[PDB]
RNA sequence: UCUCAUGGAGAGUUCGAUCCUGGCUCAGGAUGAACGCUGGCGGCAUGCUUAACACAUGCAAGUCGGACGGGAAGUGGUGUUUC
Ligand SMILES: [Mg+2]
Ligand SMILES: [Mg+2]
Ligand SMILES: [Mg+2]
């Protein structure tokens with residue numbers, strides 16, 4: 001139970017005999033601001049019903065984002081999703097969230113308050129937003145590296 | 159849980175609609191600036207990017223008499239002296 005925001009709304013058509021069925025395509029991103037990031041797509045004849053379907057589809061797939069004590073990424077990472085490549089790096093405190101439209105919301109709704117990102121591929125919000133999820137799933141904390149490597153955290157800081 | 163990092167935002171347009179590819183356009187900052195409308199003061203700076211085209215007028219490199227000969231002025235037409 002938490003809030004959501006519409007990332008994009010777009011009308012799609014049909015070429016039936018009599019005319020055209022103009023129905024909406026709603027992309028919705030869901031985030032509690034404390035991890036629990038979700039991306040979903042919905043489609044319906046009405047605007048409101050399309051947002052509801054995307055909300056269920058976004059809540060159908062939720063993933064936590066690794067963050068640090070200062071609400072930043074542990075390290076930089078890139079990802080690709082079709083023709084959509086997205087870039088991410090950590091940032092200093094007080095820097096703020098700066099990124100493209102599709103990338104700002106999914107990070108802004110995640111909880112990270114200080115980071116930066118850039119998209120190097122297509123301008124599609126869907127293909128770019130999903131790339132962010134692929135980017136964050138592949139990142140971890142320093143502790144996860146230590147247990148999977150057999151070296152303490154202080155020894156790696158050197 | 160250290161420290162480093164003070165730094166990379168996009169948007170619209172091909173299609174009935176979608177995902178791509180690829181050009182065009184915009185949001186930023188700067189100027190030896192110019193034009194338009196408007197206009198109170200102060201401080202620090204700047205001011206022919208074109209015809210290295212042609213130029214009236216005035217000035218912009220003179221100085222030493224303690225290097226020398228002469229000359230002039232003044233004075234009591236005499237000494238010192240000034241030019
Ligand atoms: Mg870009
Ligand atoms: Mg059209
Ligand atoms: Mg000149």
Ligand SMILES: [Mg+2]
Nearest residue numbers: 222223224225
């Ligand atoms: Mg001499």
